[PDB]
Design a protein around this nucleic acid. Structure first.
Ligand SMILES: [Mg+2]
Ligand SMILES: [Mg+2]
Ligand SMILES: [Mg+2]
Ligand SMILES: [Mg+2]
Ligand SMILES: [Mg+2]
Ligand SMILES: [Mg+2]
Ligand SMILES: [Mg+2]
Ligand SMILES: [Mg+2]
Ligand SMILES: [Mg+2]
Ligand SMILES: [Mg+2]
Ligand SMILES: [Mg+2]
Ligand SMILES: [Mg+2]
Ligand SMILES: [Mg+2]
Ligand SMILES: [Mg+2]
Ligand SMILES: [Mg+2]
Ligand SMILES: [Mg+2]
Ligand SMILES: [Mg+2]
Ligand SMILES: [Mg+2]
Ligand SMILES: [Mg+2]
Ligand SMILES: [Mg+2]
Ligand SMILES: [Mg+2]
Ligand SMILES: [Mg+2]
Ligand SMILES: [Zn+2]
Lengths: 56, 47, 111, 142, 95, 30, 36
RNA sequence: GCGAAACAGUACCGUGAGGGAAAGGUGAAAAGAACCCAGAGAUGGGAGUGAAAUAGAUUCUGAAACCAUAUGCCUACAACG
RNA sequence: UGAGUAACGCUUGGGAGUGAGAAUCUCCCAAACCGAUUGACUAAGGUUUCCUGGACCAGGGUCGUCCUUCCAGGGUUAGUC
């Protein structure tokens, strides 16, 4: 099955109206200050108060 | 499966070579036509 | 013969540089150009390239050299005459040496 | 006073690039950098470099404060395409069009920048009307 | 005899590997139409010491600078490997 | 000393790095 | 440093562009949908 | 306009005979953008040359289809060549 | 337009390293398949696709610091095959 009529420039965007993306929640590390994505270790390996990994 | 062209130096050279073409009037006419068209690859002898 | 040779004094009669006196250092007959010292000074933005024994230094900054000029803008300069002026030249052949010599047409000056 | 940075022949398609540009338009400098640094998309580590280059040449070349800059307009225009042949089945063939985008980012310090552009358009319209009247004035005089 | 069949010596890792260790082996490039006997005769008329043996290599021409605006083929080379006897080592440059 | 310094990189036409001739490095690139 | 190119021909962005011969030697066959 | 203004009977197709394209224009002069900034770099933004750099090698002019941004107006009970 | 849709054409995990950036590159340890074969020698054909170093315009159905891709250099030794 294939479209017997061409889709205009308005219906395409009406379908794409729901394709927008959402900005993921971010937080600030408590040891270096840079913004990091929530519930995760910053680039310095500092999660909360626990030294997880070696510095980048 | 077996496709049509299975390459071989000897068969190609003995069928469409310069010496094969220079043995009959028909072959001479074909080369004559190719000289008229000034083809760089006159025969299959040259790469 | 030729209107302009390597060495004779020449000036420019048209363009931004007017009355620009200089000495012709080199003549390209094929391109109808002429390198005249001190005139038409261009300054190529000299880069740095290091792939040779001389290219290891190749100190080049804002070197101003000479750009070639069309032969039409050139005109021969008179020197023997007391009042120097710009004119055209002939190609008379003197039987004394049987050699062709340029002579001006507004005077009787050789070369 | 708009500062800008450009990039021709970005490998990302404009369709897949517009989705990321809409997350940064109107955003502050630090927040735009922070937002773009943690988005798991391919067209995020390229807009970040252009944005960083644009901030740099805004506070160095054009001389702006740096604490009032906001992303005025970041868009990915359609760039030249390149055509290749994908071999299909049963001897057929199709044409694959690898798409490229011309990305351009613009940031301003003044939150009222649209008024000046409309003003310039208005300035152009006023000159248009002005040209007609002077031409009109000349006709009755003759 | 005319000695146009000895075109040019070549120095590579293989050449320097041979040109050391008792017997020396000198590799030149020669006229592609020349034969081994002609190579020995040319070396005789221009060096003076009879070669112990001669080996010949033919490297076929191949395409170079592919994809460049004007592609080009290679040039046909014939290589000759002269080997002088034990303990003798003459210089290719300096006569 | 000097010959060690002049054997680093500076690849000669027919050779590679590392095995630069211990005595022959002054003819082509002089 | 030592970054230079004194050769008459030298480039990193080699010029090339792929072309298409539009080879579409497609065909078809018969069918079981024949109303005679 | 000769198929062929460019290196065209070339690239390419076919075992072969044979078939057979597309592609021109910087600037008067390369004077082809030293240098600084961001970037790994290409590159971009300044600086500089130039009358002109929105003439920058993607190089005369740059149309529409086509893709985006925005001033203003309208639009989420509505049967629409 | 269809549409960012179908498809991406039989094979896993981790450690260390390089790099601006590593599921894809290098090394190591395993793991899984071939084993009358995915093992080894050659004929035919292919014609440098072989080795070293470098690069990531283009191609690799993703990525790529890597490649059978590109650049530079080199490589095929017969009285008995
Ligand atoms: Mg729209
Ligand atoms: Mg949708
Ligand atoms: Mg042999
Ligand atoms: Mg510019
Ligand atoms: Mg134009
Ligand atoms: Mg309503
Ligand atoms: Mg109702
Ligand atoms: Mg009704
Ligand atoms: Mg109605
Ligand atoms: Mg279509
Ligand atoms: Mg679509
Ligand atoms: Mg669908
Ligand atoms: Mg689906
Ligand atoms: Mg699917
Ligand atoms: Mg697969
Ligand atoms: Mg898998
Ligand atoms: Mg096998
Ligand atoms: Mg090849
Ligand atoms: Mg290899
Ligand atoms: Mg390599
Ligand atoms: Mg890729
Ligand atoms: Mg033997
Ligand atoms: Zn931290």
């Amino acid at each position: 099955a294939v479209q017997q009529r061409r889709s205009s420039k308005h219906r395409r965007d009406k379908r794409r109206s729901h394709d927008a993306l959402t900005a993921q929640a971010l937080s600030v590390c408590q040891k270096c200050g840079k913004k990091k994505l929530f519930h995760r270790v910053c680039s310095c390996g500092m999660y909360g108060d626990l030294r997880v990994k070696k510095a980048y | 499966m077996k496709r049509t062209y299975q390459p071989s130096k000897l068969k190609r050279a003995k069928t469409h070579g310069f010496l094969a073409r220079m043995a009959t009037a028909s072959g001479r006419k074909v080369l004559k036509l190719r000289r008229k068209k000034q083809r760089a690859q006159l025969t299959v002898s040259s790469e | 013969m030729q209107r302009i040779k390597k060495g004779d004094k020449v000036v420019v009669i048209t363009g931004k540089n007017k009355g620009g006196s200089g000495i012709v250092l080199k003549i390209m007959p094929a391109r109808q150009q002429a390198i005249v010292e001190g005139l038409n000074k261009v300054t190529r933005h000299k880069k740095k390239d290091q792939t040779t024994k001389r290219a290891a230094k190749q100190s080049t900054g804002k070197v101003q050299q000479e750009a070639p000029i069309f032969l039409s803008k050139l005109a021969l300069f008179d020197q023997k005459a007391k009042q120097q002026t710009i004119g055209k030249i002939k190609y008379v052949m003197d039987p004394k040496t049987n050699k062709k010599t340029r002579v001006f047409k507004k005077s009787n000056n050789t070369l | 006073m708009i500062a800008f940075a450009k990039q021709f022949r970005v490998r990302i398609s404009p369709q897949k690039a517009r989705l990321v540009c809409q997350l940064i338009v109107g955003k502050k400098t630090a927040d735009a950098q922070n937002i773009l640094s943690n988005t798991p998309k391919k067209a995020a580590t390229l807009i970040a470099k252009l944005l960083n280059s644009a901030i740099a040449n805004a506070t160095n070349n054009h001389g702006m404060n740096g604490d009032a800059l906001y992303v005025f307009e970041c868009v990915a225009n359609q760039g030249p395409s390149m055509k290749r042949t994908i071999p299909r089945a049963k001897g057929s063939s199709n044409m694959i069009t690898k798409r490229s985008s011309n990305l351009v980012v613009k940031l301003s310090d003044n939150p009222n920048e649209r008024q000046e552009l409309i003003k310039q358009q208005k300035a152009l319209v006023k000159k248009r009307v002005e040209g007609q009247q002077k031409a009109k004035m000349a006709r009755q005089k003759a | 005899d005319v000695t146009n069949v000895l075109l040019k010596p070549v120095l590579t890792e293989k050449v320097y590997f041979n040109q050391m260790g008792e017997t020396k082996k000198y590799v030149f490039v020669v006229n592609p139409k020349a034969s081994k006997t002609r190579v020995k005769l040319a070396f005789e008329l221009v060096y003076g010491i009879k070669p112990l043996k001669v080996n010949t290599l033919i490297r076929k021409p191949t395409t170079i600078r592919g994809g460049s605006r004007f592609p080009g083929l290679s040039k046909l080379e014939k290589l000759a490997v002269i080997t002088l006897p034990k303990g003798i080592a003459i210089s290719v440059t300096g006569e | 000393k000097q010959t060690q310094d002049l054997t680093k990189n500076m690849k000669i036409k027919g050779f590679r790095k590392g095995k630069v001739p211990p005595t022959l490095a002054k003819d082509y690139l002089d | 440093x030592x970054x230079x190119x004194x050769x008459x021909x030298x480039x990193x962005x080699x010029x090339x562009x792929x072309x298409x011969x539009x080879x579409x030697x497609x065909x078809x066959x018969x069918x079981x949908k024949a109303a005679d």
